Amino acid sequence: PEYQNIFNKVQVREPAYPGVELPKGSLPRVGKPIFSYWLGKIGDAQIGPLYLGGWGIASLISGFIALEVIGLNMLASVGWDPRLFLKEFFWLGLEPPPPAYGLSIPPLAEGGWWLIAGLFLTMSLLLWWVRVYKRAKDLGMGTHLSWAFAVAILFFLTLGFIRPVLMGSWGEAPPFGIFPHLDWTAAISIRYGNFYYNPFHGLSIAFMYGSAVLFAMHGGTILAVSRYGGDREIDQITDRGTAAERAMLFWRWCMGFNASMESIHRWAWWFAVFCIINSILGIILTGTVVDNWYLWAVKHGVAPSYPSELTIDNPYLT
Amino acid sequence: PSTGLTESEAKEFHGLFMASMTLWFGLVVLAHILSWMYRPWL
Amino acid sequence: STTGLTEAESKEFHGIFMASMTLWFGLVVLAHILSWLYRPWL
Amino acid sequence: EKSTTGLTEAESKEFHGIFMASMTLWFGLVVLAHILSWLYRPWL
Amino acid sequence: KSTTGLTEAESKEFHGIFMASMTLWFGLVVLAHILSWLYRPWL
Amino acid sequence: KSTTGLTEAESKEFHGIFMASMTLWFGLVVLAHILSWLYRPWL
Amino acid sequence: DNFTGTYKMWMFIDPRRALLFIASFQILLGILIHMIVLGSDLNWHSDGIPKFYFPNAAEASAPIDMSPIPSARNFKFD
Amino acid sequence: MNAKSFDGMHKLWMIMNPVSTLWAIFIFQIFLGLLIHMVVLSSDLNWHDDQIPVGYQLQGETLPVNLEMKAAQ
Amino acid sequence: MNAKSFDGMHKLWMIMNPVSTLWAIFIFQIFLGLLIHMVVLSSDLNWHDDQIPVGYQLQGETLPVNLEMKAA
Amino acid sequence: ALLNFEKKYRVRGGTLVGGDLFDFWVGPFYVGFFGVSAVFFATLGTMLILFGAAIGPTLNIWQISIAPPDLSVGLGFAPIREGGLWQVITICAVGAFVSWALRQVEIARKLGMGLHVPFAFSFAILAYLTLVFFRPVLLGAWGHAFPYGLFSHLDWVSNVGYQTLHFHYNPAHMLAISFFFINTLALAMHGSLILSVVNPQKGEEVKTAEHENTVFRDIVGYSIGALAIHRLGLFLAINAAFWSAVCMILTGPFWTRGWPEWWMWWPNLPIW
Amino acid sequence: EFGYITQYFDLAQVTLWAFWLSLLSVIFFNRREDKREGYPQEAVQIFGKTILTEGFPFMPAPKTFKLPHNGGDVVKPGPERPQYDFKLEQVDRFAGAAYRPVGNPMLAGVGPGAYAVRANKPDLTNAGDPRIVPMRVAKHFAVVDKDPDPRGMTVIGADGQVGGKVTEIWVDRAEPQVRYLELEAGNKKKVLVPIALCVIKGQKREVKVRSINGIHFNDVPTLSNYDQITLAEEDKVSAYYGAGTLYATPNRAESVL
Amino acid sequence: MTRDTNSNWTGHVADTGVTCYTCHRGKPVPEHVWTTDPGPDIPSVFPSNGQNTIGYNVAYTALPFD
Numbered sequence A: 001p002e003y004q005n006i007f008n009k010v011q012v013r014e015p016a017y018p019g020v021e022l023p024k025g026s027l028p029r030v031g032k033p034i035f036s037y038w039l040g041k042i043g044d045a046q047i048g049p050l051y052l053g054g055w056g057i058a059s060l061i062s063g064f065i066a067l068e069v070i071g072l073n074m075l076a077s078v079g080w081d082p083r084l085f086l087k088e089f090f091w092l093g094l095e096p097p098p099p100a101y102g103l104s105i106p107p108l109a110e111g112g113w114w115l116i117a118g119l120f121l122t123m124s125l126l127l128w129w130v131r132v133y134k135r136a137k138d139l140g141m142g143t144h145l146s147w148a149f150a151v152a153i154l155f156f157l158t159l160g161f162i163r164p165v166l167m168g169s170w171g172e173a174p175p176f177g178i179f180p181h182l183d184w185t186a187a188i189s190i191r192y193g194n195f196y197y198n199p200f201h202g203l204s205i206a207f208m209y210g211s212a213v214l215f216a217m218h219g220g221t222i223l224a225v226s227r228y229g230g231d232r233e234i235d236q237i238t239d240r241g242t243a244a245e246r247a248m249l250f251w252r253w254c255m256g257f258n259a260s261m262e263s264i265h266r267w268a269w270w271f272a273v274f275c276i277i278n279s280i281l282g283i284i285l286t287g288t289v290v291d292n293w294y295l296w297a298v299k300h301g302v303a304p305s306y307p308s309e310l311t312i313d314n315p316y317l318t
Numbered sequence B: 001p002s003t004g005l006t007e008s009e010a011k012e013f014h015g016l017f018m019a020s021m022t023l024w025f026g027l028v029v030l031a032h033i034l035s036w037m038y039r040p041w042l
Numbered sequence C: 001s002t003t004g005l006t007e008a009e010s011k012e013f014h015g016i017f018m019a020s021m022t023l024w025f026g027l028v029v030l031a032h033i034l035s036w037l038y039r040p041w042l
Numbered sequence D: 001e002k003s004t005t006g007l008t009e010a011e012s013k014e015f016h017g018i019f020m021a022s023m024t025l026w027f028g029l030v031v032l033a034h035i036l037s038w039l040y041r042p043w044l
Numbered sequence E, F: 001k002s003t004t005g006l007t008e009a010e011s012k013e014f015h016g017i018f019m020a021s022m023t024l025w026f027g028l029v030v031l032a033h034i035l036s037w038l039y040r041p042w043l
Numbered sequence G: 001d002n003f004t005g006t007y008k009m010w011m012f013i014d015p016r017r018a019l020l021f022i023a024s025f026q027i028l029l030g031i032l033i034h035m036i037v038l039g040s041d042l043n044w045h046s047d048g049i050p051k052f053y054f055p056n057a058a059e060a061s062a063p064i065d066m067s068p069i070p071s072a073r074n075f076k077f078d
Numbered sequence H: 001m002n003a004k005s006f007d008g009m010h011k012l013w014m015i016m017n018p019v020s021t022l023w024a025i026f027i028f029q030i031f032l033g034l035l036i037h038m039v040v041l042s043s044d045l046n047w048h049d050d051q052i053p054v055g056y057q058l059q060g061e062t063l064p065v066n067l068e069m070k071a072a073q
Numbered sequence I: 001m002n003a004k005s006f007d008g009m010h011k012l013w014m015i016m017n018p019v020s021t022l023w024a025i026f027i028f029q030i031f032l033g034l035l036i037h038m039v040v041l042s043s044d045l046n047w048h049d050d051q052i053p054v055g056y057q058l059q060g061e062t063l064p065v066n067l068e069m070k071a072a
Numbered sequence J: 001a002l003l004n005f006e007k008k009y010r011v012r013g014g015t016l017v018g019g020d021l022f023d024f025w026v027g028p029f030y031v032g033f034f035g036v037s038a039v040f041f042a043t044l045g046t047m048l049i050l051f052g053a054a055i056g057p058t059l060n061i062w063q064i065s066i067a068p069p070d071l072s073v074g075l076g077f078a079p080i081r082e083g084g085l086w087q088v089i090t091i092c093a094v095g096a097f098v099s100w101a102l103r104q105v106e107i108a109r110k111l112g113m114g115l116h117v118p119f120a121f122s123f124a125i126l127a128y129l130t131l132v133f134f135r136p137v138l139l140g141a142w143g144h145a146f147p148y149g150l151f152s153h154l155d156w157v158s159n160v161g162y163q164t165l166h167f168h169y170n171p172a173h174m175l176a177i178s179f180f181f182i183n184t185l186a187l188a189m190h191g192s193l194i195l196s197v198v199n200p201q202k203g204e205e206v207k208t209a210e211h212e213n214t215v216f217r218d219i220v221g222y223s224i225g226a227l228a229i230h231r232l233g234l235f236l237a238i239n240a241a242f243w244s245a246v247c248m249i250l251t252g253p254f255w256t257r258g259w260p261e262w263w264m265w266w267p268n269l270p271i272w
Numbered sequence K: 001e002f003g004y005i006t007q008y009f010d011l012a013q014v015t016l017w018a019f020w021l022s023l024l025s026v027i028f029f030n031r032r033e034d035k036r037e038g039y040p041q042e043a044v045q046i047f048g049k050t051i052l053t054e055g056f057p058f059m060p061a062p063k064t065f066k067l068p069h070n071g072g073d074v075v076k077p078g079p080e081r082p083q084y085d086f087k088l089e090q091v092d093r094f095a096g097a098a099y100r101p102v103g104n105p106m107l108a109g110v111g112p113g114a115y116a117v118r119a120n121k122p123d124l125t126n127a128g129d130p131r132i133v134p135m136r137v138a139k140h141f142a143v144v145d146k147d148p149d150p151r152g153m154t155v156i157g158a159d160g161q162v163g164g165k166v167t168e169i170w171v172d173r174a175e176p177q178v179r180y181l182e183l184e185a186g187n188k189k190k191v192l193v194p195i196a197l198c199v200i201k202g203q204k205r206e207v208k209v210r211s212i213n214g215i216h217f218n219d220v221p222t223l224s225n226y227d228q229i230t231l232a233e234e235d236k237v238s239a240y241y242g243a244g245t246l247y248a249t250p251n252r253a254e255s256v257l
Numbered sequence L: 001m002t003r004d005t006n007s008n009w010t011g012h013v014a015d016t017g018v019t020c021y022t023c024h025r026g027k028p029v030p031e032h033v034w035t036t037d038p039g040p041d042i043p044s045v046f047p048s049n050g051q052n053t054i055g056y057n058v059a060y061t062a063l064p065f066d
């Protein structure tokens, strides 16, 4: 057939690019850039350099302290054996305090290490937030990447710090494992009567499906007009060429309305952020306001009603 | 001058910085004396 | 001159800023005296 | 060729003087805190 | 050829101070372990 | 052709010091194992 | 001596980066040691010395994992 | 030395940016304030829920008007 | 040799970068310090919770003031 | 209505079936043979869903449900009131989805561009056909497919999941979820970056491609590129769909125990 | 009692309403941003009159892009540059009918061969230099071995005939990658072909261009100066190759089945 | 115990009942029995939480193993 533009057939090298000049008073960039042939088959081949200033070092100290703690407790749970660590790795975890301790600080091997790791991971993510903000603002760009990051951090803090405090127990938070955190997911659905009848859960699922749909559509459309220079979106925005025109006619003819080369990126932004906004809203109300989502859905006229034919006798009533 | 401040500007900033930090620590000490009078913890 | 304000403009701004902050703190103190009279917490 | 920070030898001497003074003062304060803690709640 | 830009004199200087520092560090480590053995013997 | 820029004299020098260092390291390892066998024999 | 030329250290190590590392590390280590000591028998906030100030539970068991969420606040588990 | 060892100290602001440092200090202080208040509230020294000098929810449950209304039902 | 075997050793820093080495050593030492302290605290040699030279939680539970308050 | 620039692109040709008979527009839409087909099948399917709601107990939007046949019908033909309506609607649905894809192909041929979008749509279609055709055929009955109803296909999803005690431990399910999550993250970052470069700090010029590379190399140390992020996007979404189809074809036809017990092959390797 | 109800109104309900209203309102703002290109639209009336309409919701107020290196201001929604001179005949007498090109379809600029009217300036780097340039002007680039160097190969043209030979590669300095191949055609002109319309076979040492025919490489649009390319010229070149996807063979626009 | 189950628990074993063979199946020690699980070996100052292992009796999940 015709070239599909999925891999780079011919590669070219020039000396590495150090980066746009920073404002005066900045630290130098660390690292000497290297090139990857395999990364260059699909994208850009340069790796590095990297910018390490004040906020991105405090972050990376916090995060690595947290990682050391989590790893060592997982390793103590098998008796220090690395062979068993590799053998049973998906079943290990660091577990939260027993719920009877409330919001106090428990002893170290009965939930205090969980508390330490949570605190250090929190600080890591807030320092990283400041780094992302300043990096985009020192180059003179809008700070749109910090708004979305803030939303994600808020969801991490909701399930984990805010909801456990509003409930009165640290033992309501997830543990640090793979299968352990999957077990937490299932159990919190079972305890509060079926998350499928949580309406914010349904809306966030709507927006996660929509993210996949929209990004398949956009990735397809821009690869399909890259023969007319469509992959260069900044120029198509500030001087509309034939690639943008064809891209917008396609969708107009197909489904009756369209966006522009700049507006589709606002649709992307919002579809990714409403998913997490509804995530926060659905978790923050569970347990603190609603105790059984299925009974809520029945009270508000939402759940179907299968035919019965039988009678089952509740043995606690007999 | 990696910050562009001369030595005079640095001296000025340092003067006011040290004064402010001393005042802040004074207020902290006062808060702790009140707390010890109300609810001693050691 | 980093903010473009001269020294006179900075003096002016500082005067009004300090006055406003003092008034705000006064209102805060008043609110707390009323709350202590109604529902003492310590 | 070689990695440098642009400091001459005089600037390095100056920085080193103040760095060592500051570190010594900090360690002094640490020792004092530990003497107080040992007097209040001995741990060994 | 892989090189650091240091001449042989600079390397000699660096090596002198590096070895002195490492020796002092190991001395402090030995002292800490003697104290720990006196307080709480582990073997 | 893959080459490191070292001549044959430089390679001889490097090899001398490399072998000396490796021998000293293995000596220290043997000593550690003799002590461990005296304290807690494992076979 | 042997440490005569140590001050030349700052001619190839950046003093700005060194300072930024040391401050961060010291503050984080402070927080860490305080939380570690609080999660042990040396804890000094809820140890009941010189007095227990809260209306604690009269009979608080040793908490296990298969537990419900507590009804009131309590800080005396031992 | 030991009396005049800290005379160069004002030169600190020729390598560290003053406004960045001010902002960093302020943000760190606010974060630490929130953290220490939350750590002390989760101990025996808690001062909001200790019911001193009186418990107010319990005071509202036992008002004579509320008691007389709860009797009538 | 056996005595002249380590003569040219000082040339090491003509092929190994001093700055990278310094940073690596410092970071590795801090990580190892944290690790060994955590491994020893999780054993029988633990020194914070061993109740030596005295148990402090137990000491606080048996103060006369606390005992008299618990008696009611 | 036509856009400012639209008239010079509305030419004839590019079709698959039909020819010059259905080559026109109605408003902004383009019709074609497959446009007629799609609207025909969508209308018929919708009207049959509504009738199946009319013969049920309620017209509440949340509680309508049309269910498939019983498992005793096998791969046969069910009565209209006990499963046959579901079969007719599920024929209409396939007809409409395939018509949609082929209409897309006609449009792209007319505008001179590549067939990436109908090709990515094909994988959604494949997941649907897995749930209604392939899995039922391998298990031997139409009554293994899901009913048509909001809230009522969710009861199906729940009970099917619990037929394996813990469906989170399904391996292809884990892989698909990984792709879904990473796709939302990537879409957020891409949206943010383009907006940020054409909407800079107040009183600045529009930035360039060098700025786009620099920002991510500063934060993270690697930047993938402006054309490769579109590729990465097509890739993550398609893979999500693909591994969903695999995870459902595995459950029932090729595995009947609990899903946690599959993973037992790993700690039983004779190498630890 | 298993399903007893205490009160009908709760917080989850109100919050859900608030969300319905917060969506339903970003739709409004995004739909308004969608109409900074291509509007007001042209509605054709009962007997052919055309008016400008604007849709629902209405168009936003204009915003300004400030282009770098004194590249001017761009107001959007703003004016438009004039279309060129396409000729078209409608096929059926109603507003929604299709059109046919009047002359030679390859040289007409209608259908997949239409293009836009951009600036007559090159795209710039962050330093002010032209972005897309031949590899003899950019003296620091090199093709990575492990990859077939296309310089020298032939340009077979979709009917098996030879178009010409590759003589240059055009690179992109802002993001290092190949954008165009330059070739000498049958009548000794220098023409470009986009790299995204070329299948390169290293062993056959061929480049297959499925779009147009071999004799069609003589009429590809040419450049003014061969040390740079402008936005307009990029559009013209690419559009000429895109017209062949429907006009190269008389059977290409003619209903597969 | 067998007489008690066969007479007093028919809400569960309804008119089919049990014999020895229902559990011993011709052996003196039954095949599927349980005792209070201590858990894996961990450091001596670490109390058991009772989960996050393989868990052979709870269908190989990371759920509480006893």
Ligand code: BCL
Binding pocket: B024, B027, B028, B029, B031, B032, B035, B039, C025, H026, H029, H030, H032, H033, H034, H040, H045, H047
């Ligand atoms: C049992 C424990 C005690 C208690 C023991 C202590 C102790 C001990 C301390 C405090 C301190 C504070 N406590 Mg208290 N505190 C209690 C209960 C409360 C309650 C409440 C809801 O119960 C509140 C809202 C507060 C709030 C406060 C803040 C006023 C203050 C921390 C400020 C800060 O973080 O600056 C961080 C921000 C900056 C450094 C920014 C830089 C300077 C800025 C520009 C100026 C801000 C002014 C500042 C807020 C003070 C203004 C007062 C004026 C001088 C009149 N406490 C209980 C009763 N609290 C600390 C304090 O007072 O510091 C002096 C302190 O040391």
Ligand code: BCL
Binding pocket: C024, C027, C028, C029, C031, C032, C035, C039
């Ligand atoms: C038992 C606890 C008490 C109580 C104890 C306190 C205490 C103590 C305080 C408050 C304060 C406030 N309380 Mg109260 N409060 C209670 C119950 C309420 C209820 C309610 C629905 O039950 C409401 C709505 C409020 C609302 C308020 C706000 C007016 C005020 C917070 C201001 C602020 O956030 O600054 C945020 C915004 C700014 C700082 C912007 C700066 C100023 C700008 C220019 C304009 C602001 C105008 C200002 C809001 C109003 C004052 C104007 C006067 C009419 C002159 N309280 C209960 C009964 N409340 C605070 C206060 O009064 O401040 C002085 C305060 O210290």
Ligand code: BCL
Binding pocket: D026, D029, D030, D031, D033, D034, D037, D041, G022, G023, G026, G027, G030, G031, G037, G044, H036
């Ligand atoms: C049972 C245990 C004891 C206890 C035993 C100890 C011991 C032992 C030590 C501390 C130390 C500290 N303790 Mg204590 N501490 C207790 C209870 C507390 C409580 C509380 C809520 O109960 C608080 C808030 C503190 C807080 C503090 C800090 C003031 C100090 C940590 C400094 C630091 O983090 O490095 C920050 C470091 C830097 C940023 C780098 C170097 C500092 C430079 C010069 C610039 C920073 C400005 C300034 C100097 C900051 C410190 C203020 C003082 C002047 C020291 N402790 C209990 C009662 N604590 C440490 C200390 O005293 O240090 C001297 C210490 O060794």
Ligand code: BCL
Binding pocket: E028, E029, E032, E033, E036, E040, G033, I026, I029, I030, I033, I034, I040, I045, I047
């Ligand atoms: C039962 C076990 C014993 C114990 C047995 C040991 C043993 C054994 C050792 C330590 C060592 C250390 N222990 Mg201890 N330790 C115990 C309990 C503690 C507790 C505590 C809260 O309970 C703390 C906070 C410490 C802290 C420390 C650090 C000072 C030190 C690790 C240094 C390092 O990692 O350098 C990494 C950093 C670098 C290499 C960079 C350069 C060093 C910088 C410039 C200075 C760091 C501090 C310095 C060594 C001391 C100050 C200088 C001198 C006063 C001149 N121990 C208990 C009581 N501990 C080690 C040590 O001290 O070696 C010297 C060591 O061998």
Ligand code: BCL
Binding pocket: E026, F025, F028, F029, F032, F033, F036, F040, I036
């Ligand atoms: C029952 C088991 C025994 C035990 C049996 C052994 C045996 C057997 C050996 C060790 C060895 C080591 N043991 Mg032991 N060891 C025990 C308990 C401990 C404990 C503890 C916390 O309980 C610690 C911290 C150590 C630590 C150590 C290290 C000193 C050494 C590992 C070196 C290495 O990895 O370098 C690898 C890294 C490099 C080579 C990088 C190169 C860096 C250069 C060359 C400088 C490095 C300095 C080097 C670490 C030590 C040289 C010591 C000086 C002469 C003072 N052991 C228990 C009691 N241990 C090994 C050893 O002695 O090596 C000779 C060894 O063979």
Ligand code: BCL
Binding pocket: A185, J097, J124, J125, J127, J128, J130, J131, J156, J157, J158, J159, J160, J161, J162, J167, J168, J173, J176, J177, J241, J243, J244, J245, J247, J248
């Ligand atoms: C107790 C239940 C189990 C569970 C049981 C199941 C079951 C059972 C299934 C999944 C499936 C999925 N699960 Mg699961 N799942 C659970 C927990 C999770 C969790 C989580 C956070 O816990 C996540 C993130 C997921 C995520 C997923 C995805 C991997 C997958 C759904 C995407 C998909 O199928 O696309 C595929 C896309 C389609 C099927 C869409 C079809 C599109 C059609 C062609 C177009 C329709 C157009 C329409 C009619 C037009 C309307 C037009 C209007 C004009 C607008 N599950 C719990 C543990 N899960 C599903 C799956 O993998 O199926 C393949 C599946 O069947």
Ligand SMILES: CC(C)=CCC/C(C)=C\CC/C(C)=C/CC/C(C)=C\CC/C(C)=C/CC/C(C)=C/CC/C(C)=C/CC/C(C)=C/CC1=C(C)C(=O)c2ccccc2C1=O
Binding pocket: A213, A214, A217, A218, A219, A221, A222, A244, A247, A248, A251, A255, A256, A257, A258, A259, A260, A261, A264, A267, J026, J029, J030, J031, J035, J036, J039, J042
């Ligand atoms: C049904 C009926 C009663 C019919 C009677 C009418 C008659 C008689 C005939 C009409 C003729 C025909 C054939 C009509 C068929 C159409 C019908 C009826 C229905 C289909 C409508 C339909 C399926 C719409 C669904 C719309 C939805 C929900 C879309 C989901 C995704 C979404 C929200 C997208 C918004 C963002 C957009 C607009 C993305 C498109 C878009 C993308 C993805 C880019 O990448 C891009 C790149 C550069 C420039 C522009 C774009 C661009 O616009």
Ligand SMILES: COC(C)(C)CCC/C(C)=C/C=C/C(C)=C/C=C/C(C)=C/C=C/C=C(C)/C=C/C=C(C)/C=C/C=C(\C)CCCC(C)(C)OC
Binding pocket: B001, D011, D012, D014, D015, D018, D019, D022, D023, D026, G022, G032, G033, G036, H008, H009, H010, H011, H012, H013, H014, H015, I030, I033, I034, I035, I037, I038
């Ligand atoms: C223009 O300017 C010029 C250059 C010309 C002149 C400038 C002069 C100036 C302005 C100089 C300024 C100098 C300053 C202010 C210097 C400040 C120096 C300080 C305070 C240095 C302090 C250093 C502290 C150190 C190195 C401490 C290190 C401690 C360590 C590594 C501890 C490790 C502990 C461990 C691993 C224990 C863990 C135990 C447990 C239980 C937590 O583990 C789990």
Ligand SMILES: COC(C)(C)CCC/C(C)=C/C=C/C(C)=C/C=C/C(C)=C/C=C\C=C(C)\C=C\C=C(C)\C=C\C=C(/C)CCCC(C)(C)OC
Binding pocket: A067, A068, A070, A071, A072, A075, A103, A104, A105, A115, A117, A118, A119, A122, A156, A157, A159, A160, A161, A173, A174, A175, A176, A177, A178, A181, H035, H038, H039, H042
């Ligand atoms: C052997 O390994 C070594 C040591 C060598 C290192 C290797 C590290 C490795 C292999 C690590 C593996 C890690 C894995 C698999 C981690 C899995 C992580 C997952 C999937 C985690 C999922 C969820 C966890 C969440 C959401 C936790 C949220 C916790 C929060 C928000 C904590 C909040 C606590 C706070 C803010 C502190 C309050 C404390 C205080 C003091 C205020 O209380 C009063």
Ligand SMILES: [Ca+2]
Binding pocket: D043, D044, I047, I048, I049, I050, I051, I052, I053
């Ligand atoms: Ca002790």
